[PDB]
């Protein structure tokens, strides 16, 4: 059917139930300190 | 200001036609254009759009019989009678008569009705089906932070056109043309920390759902070419120059069958 | 107070017309305006608005046949008969007759019915399709705190207009004009701490969904120009001054085909 | 008590009219008021209100033909015949006749039917479209604790009015007037601690959705002014004092076109 | 017991009438009450109640033509004929005739039908619109523990009344009266600990949605007063005592216009 | 056992009547009971019950015309003809005739049809409105553990009754009676620990939604009393003993107006 | 640009036909093609698509009677009369007559109507059922990080075709052909860390829902072959060359029964 | 490629018939096949499929009267007249007559209509019920990691067939046959760690919902066998060889009763 | 409208999304020990 | 539209998704001890 | 469309799924002690 | 009725509200270390 | 289709299920102290 | 019926209620350090 495109990020993208994972998928990847 | 209605984006050009149209318009001219009569290429598909679209939004438009007419008119092969909204035409003729049956209309603007020009054949038809997601798909990989995906669906729409001979009532030719509407989507998003506490997120998206009306128009144009070939083959509407029997186009759609 | 109904925001101006209107109004005058008859440019698109809009809210309006009339009337080329709500016109004529068939009406205000002026052609048509999100998109990037995005969709609306010759019933010309409604959205939001515990959040938004009625009006105006060109080309309604055959406008829409 | 139904808030005044009404009422008087006949300014917009409003709640009211009548009646230019609910009028005339066709009704209260006064023109029309959120927007910033925002939407409503000449059936003038309903909202909320454990939260809100019926009334009043101008221009209903051709109002709506 | 149906709360008094009724009843008596004929003040608003109310629950009642009759009857100015459910009246007259066309009915209880008393004018009308939340609002502040709020909405309802002259069919006067239904809500809640582990929570609420039927009744009563004024002004139903032309009430509603 | 259907709880007594009934039954007897004719007190309220009730469940019943008949019959003032389901009555009379038009029916059980007794007046009416939550409310406080609350709503239902004179077709009297359905709810719940780990929770609830049918019945009974008063006042159905003009009841409902 | 409507993906070829078509086209030629009459192979399945598809989207298309015609026409065995949209054919013949019953049509383009060629048999039918998920399934295993799955459903669609002898009205043969639409899906996704904090996620998907229209077309083609066999067997439409009684194809579908 | 529509999975074989068919086909031949007339085995079950299936998807198909015909035709006992879509048959006979009532049809292809062969009995019927989940169930146990389950439901479908004697209108036999559609599901999933951080998850599934159309076909075939037995028993359609009265099959279905 | 009465407690009262608060509104009030 | 009044507290007020905040909006305000 | 105004705070404002954030958006801003 | 089969695992199986338990039903069964 | 614009922030923007992430997407970015 | 294919991952795949498990199904499998 039609592909009603929609961002994946919660910010500037609407669907908020995705915020818990996305940010957690970056603190878990954060290889930086100081 | 803020309260002015939006300004217009694009120029309302002609409807973009596929290759099949520039493939249909350049057909060999026949001996004489045939009066044709197309009544109703109804919506036999019985399919309505899924969620979130409204329940009643028909999958394929009820457009046809207004696109088949254009198809026939475009190729210099058929002259399409109206026969659709014919009741309006008969009301307007009733009014022409009731307006000049006193002879008092000004001798300039009096409309000489002849009689409803009647057509030798009749191109009935149908949209015999619109199946959604006949073949889905889509790959998406995402390394550290950066990610990119893809999706694509095919909606297959099939159209049937029957040239019924109005004299004897029997069917002369019947063609089934399919088309595969392609609806794809691409995204690429970056969600990695770049510094200690500087989160760089970004995302670019794009999506193209080929319009069903244009795919239906291309399907009907190919159907018209197949009708013209199935006619030229056996007995009907022979070409003006028989040498063009092996035309570049009439050999392409002759071998697709 | 608080209980007064809201005061009016903007001045109800004329409907904003696209370039195609100021492109249509300035056509070369013909020999004589043609009586035209437009019955019903129905809504053949069979599309209803998605969620959250109500299920029954038709995608494109049933407006047409009230916008095509304005299109024809605007170009100094056609005089549009009513033929739409004709039953009301016939009731009012029935009442005129039943009101002055005694001759007792005051000699001043008696309405001399002539007869329903009948038109030489008939511009039937349809909205052959309104596809939603034919081509979506939208990029959004967000650095530390500050972020900004964009979305845009195209809704393609196609319109078919057929000038059927009422005398012989056959179709003279048939044009398909498309238009791409553009609906875009922009946002920019700041959600970064600026101090130890002073959170500065802010957000500006904007959105423009080009109205479907205005895009349909521009599509129909272009359709009317194409009808006038397809006529001027072959046999019908030749211009007043043949030198204007190569007019600036009649060469623009002549080459779009 | 607690069981008494609520007491009335405001005084049911006249419907608040926009500037266009006080701009319409003060038109130059014509030679003589024209009998006009308005049958049905139907709801061609095919739009229903989105969620949470019920599915069937039409976007713009079916009011028109009861607001156009008021518009015509207000300007001292047209005398509007009923022609709407005409069947009730004909039933009441049937009853008048069946009540005094014996001559036995008291010579005082006998109603001398003349005949249905018939009108020289007919103002047909339509609501050619009501698009929602043609242009949204809204900025909101929130510092430490204190925050404030804003939203606004435009709903564009367009109206078409056609003065069809009932004698010859052709259309004399056709105008398209738009209006931009403005619906905005303001809030300001404070949610900061003021002491160690004394949380002061507060919030003030406000919202104004300009009523669709009033915007439609202003659109129709402007449409009526444009009809009167398009008539005064060429051939119809010339003014009483030709010197008022350049009236302050008839030059404002003459230049908007 | 527990199984007895609930006992009745309040006394079913007369419908509470606004100021406009005690403002309407005290009108100057005319020369003679006018027979009036009100057929159907239909529901042209095309609005249905939002969620959670059922989809089909019309916003404003279909009551009118049963409230306009009461309005006309109340002011000692009009005698309202039925003309609504007239078919039932004609069935009952058919039965009266078929019951006494033998003359055998007892000479006491025989009903002397005269003929359907027919009215000199006809008050048609409509509910030209019911817009919801034309102007919302509401402030709420909450200190430590204690909090209090407020909300209010306006629903604007407009009514059109046209006194059509049944003799000549033309409209004599047409008035548009608006009313602003006020629906507000107040709450105050305490949710603070008062001791170490003694949580005192409490909350008082209240809400008043002014009933739409009463606002519609007040709108129609004001409409009737405006009709009586627009008549008294020019030519119709002149008062009994011309000195009461400047009555206290007929100058209030004369200046609202 | 477990498979027996439930046993009956309460005795199906007469419908509980409010004070207005014991206030209506004890009216002064007139000279003679008047034949009355009630056709259809329709449901003009156009309101359906909100969630969770089904979409189609009408707010107020379609009962009326079966409750107004009982109201009229109860007061020793009117004899109500059927006129509702009259078609069934006419079928049964058709059958009586076709059964004894041969004279062969047994001389005992032959039914002497006289003719449909026809009524001198006709009590038309309507339920002019049922507004929900005209005035909500409810306080609830909860100390440590123990808590108690309350809610209450008013649903206002208004009824219109018009005594139309069937002879001349005009309306004699028209009354509007309102009623305030009261729907309240009480709860009290205890959720405090009483020991170290012995949690005592408990909760008692109760709710009374006054039935809409009983409130409508009381509204209609008051409407009937007001009709009888508005008649006794001016010209109709004068009492048997004029001394009872100042009856205890006819002075209560005389001063409510 | 961004505002151009999407370009066309695939070439609208002929509808892909299964093996059964290339198995049906190569049938032995009979003595003479039989005029056949197919009226309506209705949708007796009474099945609509589940969620998320719209409520009204019929499971199998209403296509049939436009696919059975193609089936019959393809095998050189039947000549299919229209008999579907026959009313349009009769309107076009009415117009042919009314256009040349004056003899004034140009001697070239006059259409010699013979009479509606009538067929010796009639192939009625139905889609006797479309059951969804007659047999689901699907295995999916996922080791550390890497995972892969599979799903598949069968939707069984059965079609009934009855060759009714139009002379005597009785049924000659009746065949039931089934088809098993296969709808499967494959995915493979990798979600394992590859480094300390480098998360490599990826996923490839694919899905094929065999279109219902193509399965129905294959079912109907097999049904036609079975009809031709059940005829050739006993008494009807014997072959041209009896030696081809044991044809390679007519022995395959002879043994399936 | 990716854009080709899916290729066909299985061969569209004949509809799989249960044991009852191979039990029905091998019946003893009667003296002579009986003309039978089956009009409409309607869907009296009044059941629609639950969620997620669409609201309108009927539980059992409207197939019957197209499956009962096949049942009767299969056993060499009845010759089924059409009588369903009879109107199409009568239209085709009307066309045959109007095509050869001039005698001008070619002497070869003229169809000798005899008259609608009329049947001695009539097999009316119904689907007297389709109850869902008459008996659910399902066991599932899961040890450490490994787990396996099962579910099964029975949907009972009952069919009634009445052989009504068309001569005298009375019913000769009436049989009720039930069938228990079995819908079961099996799964087995492994979700145990196998190593320190190597999670092995896997899962195999399977499901079989016996198609309702096939169960209905078997129910109707058994119903036909019971009809043939109830006839052979008493008076009707005696066998060709009375020795086959105790046939292997006619004793199986004789003892089931 | 009709007041379809329903308990507030999750146990013997249905609405389960209320269990998190009610019990927490009692551990926070628990002034007992031992 | 009509203002179907409804308490804000989860207890004696129905909407339970509000219990997490309300009580937390009081432990955060609890200035008492012992 | 119509802007059915509604408070943002869960208390005196209805929508309770907002209570978790609002209060947390104030404990995170609380610059006070003692 | 029809048994619309659907996996139980959230990954490759859709229903995500099952992920919290399944994985927790394996960490609780994890008898391995090192 | 129409783009019914709506803020992304829960405060002054409605959709509350976004509050858990947004604020957490700022405490995780908070590079300030004292 | 039709198999409306949809990714299983929340990122680039939509269904966000799956993010809690997927990432947790990888931290539980993470056999890497330093």
Interface of E with J in 46-65 (CB under 8 A): 49-50, 52-53
Backbone φ, ψ for residue D112 (5° rounding): -80, 85
* CA–CA min distance G172, chain A (Å): 44
Residue C140: beta bridge partners? B203
Choose among H13, H81, H111: nearest Cβ to G118.
H111
CA end-to-end span of chain J, whole Å?
49
Per the omega criterion (within 30 degrees of 0), is the bond before G133 cis? no
Task: State the smallest CA–CA distance between residue L21 and chain N in angstroms.
Answer: 9
Contact list, D2 vs chain F (CB under 8 Å): 135, 137, 152
Residue linked to tokens 């100042």: F246
CA G143 to chain centre: 43
List Cα–Cα distances, G5 to A27, B208, C155, C218, in angstroms: 41, 9, 9, 17
Report helix, strand or coil for H257: coil
Q: Do chains N and E touch, with touching meaning 3 or more CB–CB pairs less than 8 Å apart?
A: no
Does E53 sit within 8 Å of F50, measured CB to CB?
yes
Residue with tokens 């318009």: B25
Tokens 């004793």 found at: H251
B2: distance to nearest CA of chain D, Å?
8
| DSSP category for residue E110 | -
- Compare all CA atoms of chain H with the CA of G254 and give the residue at the minimum distance: H14
Nearest CA in chain H to B183: H3
Among chain G residues, the shortest Cα distance to A27 is held by G197
List, in sequence order, every beta strand (DSSP E) within F63-145: 78-81, 121-131, 135-142
Alpha-helical segments (H) within chain H = 19-24, 68-74, 86-100, 212-234, 248-255
F237: three-class secondary structure by DSSP: coil
Q: Is the peptide bond before C52 cis (omega within 30 degrees of 0)?
A: yes
Q: Does B198 touch chain M (CB under 8 A)?
A: yes
Nearest to G208 by CA among H56, A18, C57, B153: B153
Is the distance from CB of M19 to CB of K25 less than 8 angstroms?
yes
SS3 label, residue C109: coil
Nearest chain C Cα distance for residue D250, angstroms: 14
Chains that touch J (3 or more CB pairs under 8 A): D, E, F, I, K
Contacting chains of D (3 CB pairs or more, <8 Å) are B, C, E, F, J, K, M
Nearest to L2 among G132, G149, G191 (CB): G132
Contact M7 D149 (CB under 8 A): yes
Angle between the N-to-C axes of helices K19-27 and M19-27, in degrees from 0 to 180, rounded to the nearest 10: 20
Q: Which two tokens stand for residue D197?
A: 């454990």
Q: Do E197 and I25 touch (CB under 8 A)?
A: no
The residues of C whose Cβ lies within 8 A of any Cβ of G are 134-135, 137, 152, 154, 156, 178, 180, 182
Query: What is the DSSP track for F44-63?
Result: TT--B--TTS-TT-BSS-S-
The per-residue DSSP string of D47-89 comes to -B--TTS-TT-BSS-S-TTSSHHHHHHHTTTEEEE--SSHHHH
User: Phi-psi category of J6—alpha, beta or left, where left has phi over 0 and alpha has psi -120 to 50?
Assistant: beta
E-chain CB neighbours of K7 within 8 Å are 138, 140, 149, 151
Q: Provide the residue count of chain F.
A: 257
Name beta bridge partners: C159: C177
The Cα–Cα gap between M5 and E155 comes to 25
Tokens of N21: 């498990």
Give H216 to chain G, closest Cα distance, Å.
10
User: How many Å apart are CA A6 and CA D144, to the nearest integer?
Assistant: 31
Cα–Cα distance, E11 to D1 (Å, whole number): 13
Three-state secondary structure call for residue F66: coil
- Say yes or no for a CB contact (<8 Å) between B156 and H4: no
**In which element (H, E) is residue C147 found?**
strand C146-165
Q: What is the DSSP letter of E43?
A: -
* At least 3 CB pairs under 8 A between chains N and H: yes
Cis ω before E52 (30° cut-off from 0): yes
Tokens of E128: 């030209």
Q: What is the DSSP string of E116-134?
A: ----SEEEEEEEEEEES-S
Contact N5 B133 (CB under 8 A): yes
* B and F make contact (3+ CB pairs below 8 Å): no
Closest alpha carbon to E155 in E206, E242, E213: E213
Report the b/e string of B198-230 with b at 16+ CB within 10 A: ebbbbbbbbbbbbbbbbbbbbbbbbbbbbbbbb
Instruction: Please note each residue after which chain H is broken, C-to-N distance over 2.5 A, or write none.
Output: none
Q: Which of C20, C67, C19, C27 is nearest to C43 (CA)?
A: C67
Resolution of the coordinates, Å: 3.6
Residue L13 Cα, gap to closest chain N Cα (Å): 8
Cis peptide before E91 (omega within 30 of 0): no
Does the beta carbon of I23 lie under 8 angstroms from any beta carbon of chain J? no
Number of Cβ within 10 Å of residue C222's Cβ equals 29
Cβ of L30 under 8 Å from any chain G Cβ? no
User: What method was applied to determine this entry?
Assistant: cryo-EM
Residue J6 contacts by C-beta under 8 Å, 6 or more apart in sequence? Answer: J13, J14, J15, K14
Strand partners, E158: E129, E178
Q: DSSP string of chain B?
A: --SSPPPP-S---BPPP-HHHHHHTTPPPBSSPEEEE---EE-TT--B--TTS-TT-BSS-S-TTSSHHHHHHHTTTEEEE--SSHHHHHHHHHHHHHHHTTS-S-SSS----------SEEEEEEEEEEES-SEEEEEEEE-SSEEEEEEEEEEEEEEEEEEEETTT-BEEEEEEEEEEEEEEEEEEEEEEE-SSS-EEEEEEEEEEE--HHHHHHHHHHHHHHHHHHHHHHHTSS-BSSGGGGG-HHHHHHHH--
Q: Does L19 touch chain N (CB under 8 A)?
A: yes
H153 touches chain L (CB under 8 A): yes
D192, D200, D212: best to mutate for the K interface, most K CBs within 10 A:
D192
Among candidate residues E89, E77, E76, the one with its CA nearest the CA of residue E121: E77
Residue of J nearest to K3 (CA): J1
Which chains are adjacent to chain F, needing at least 3 Cβ pairs under 8 Å?
D, E, I, J
State whether L1 and H199 contact (CB < 8 Å).
no
Indicate the residue of G133, G192, G207 with minimum beta-carbon distance to N29.
Answer: G192
- CA D222/CA D206 separation, integer angstroms: 30
Residues of chain G contacting residue H67, judged by C-beta atoms under 8 Å apart: 128, 160, 176
Q: Are strands F146-165 and F199-209 parallel, antiparallel or unpaired?
A: unpaired
Q: Tell me how far apart the alpha carbons of residues D214 and D217 are, in angstroms, rounded to a whole number.
A: 5
CB contact under 8 A, G131 and H212: yes
- Does H69 sit within 8 Å of G137, measured CB to CB? no
Smallest Cβ–Cβ distance between K2 and the set E132, E138, E149 belongs to E132
Closest CA of chain I from J2, distance in Å: 11
| CB-neighbour burial class of residue C51 (10 A; exposed 0-12, middle 13-18, buried 19+) | middle
Residues making up chain E, counted from first to last: 257
Give the tokens for residue N18: 């799956």
d(CA H137, CA H184): 9
**Chain K CA closest to residue C52:** K1
Count Cα atoms within 13 angstroms, Cβ side, for G211.
33
Residues of A in contact with M18 (CB under 8 A): 10, 16, 19
M27 min Cα distance to partner chain B (Å): 10
Interaxial angle between packed helices E248-255 and E212-234, expressed in degrees from 0 to 180 and rounded to the nearest 10: 100
Q: How far is B6 from chain H (nearest CA, A)?
A: 38
Q: What is the DSSP letter of C235?
A: T
Q: Alpha helices of chain G — where are they, by DSSP H? A: 19-24, 68-74, 86-100, 212-234, 248-255
Local structure of residue F255 (DSSP, 8 states)? H
Cα atoms found within 13 Å of the Cα of residue F178, Cβ hemisphere only: 23
For residue D211, give both structure tokens: 């009523």
């Amino acid at each position: 059917g039609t592909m009603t495109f929609q961002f994946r990020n919660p910010n500037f993208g609407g669907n908020p139930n995705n915020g818990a994972f996305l940010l957690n998928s970056a603190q878990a990847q954060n290889s930086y300190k100081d | 200001c803020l309260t002015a209605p939006p300004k217009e984006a694009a120029r309302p050009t002609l409807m973009p036609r596929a290759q099949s149209y520039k493939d249909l318009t350049h057909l060999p001219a026949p001996t004489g254009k045939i009066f044709v009569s197309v009544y109703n290429i109804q919506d036999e598909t019985g399919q309505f759009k899924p969620y979130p679209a409204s329940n009643f939004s028909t999958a394929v438009p009820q457009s046809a019989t207004a696109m088949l007419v254009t198809a026939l008119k475009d190729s210099r092969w058929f002259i399409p009678l109206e026969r659709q909204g014919l009741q309006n035409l008969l009301n307007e003729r009733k009014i022409i008569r009731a307006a000049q049956e006193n002879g008092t209309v000004a001798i300039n603007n009096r409309i000489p009705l002849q009689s409803l020009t009647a057509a030798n054949i009749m191109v009935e038809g149908s949209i015999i089906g619109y199946e959604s997601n006949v073949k889905s798909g889509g790959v998406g990989a995402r390394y550290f932070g950066i990610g990119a995906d893809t999706q694509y669906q095919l909606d297959q729409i099939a159209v049937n056109l029957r040239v019924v001979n109005v004299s004897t009532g029997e069917i002369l030719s019947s063609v089934n043309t399919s088309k595969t509407i392609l609806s794809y989507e691409v995204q690429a998003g970056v969600f990695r920390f770049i510094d200690y506490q500087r989160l760089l997120e970004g995302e670019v998206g794009y999506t193209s759902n080929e319009p069903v009306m244009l795919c239906l128009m291309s399907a009907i144009e190919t159907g018209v070419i197949f009708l013209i070939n199935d006619g030229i083959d056996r007995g009907l509407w022979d070409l003006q120059n028989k040498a063009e029997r092996q035309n570049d186009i009439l050999v392409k759609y002759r071998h697709m069958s």
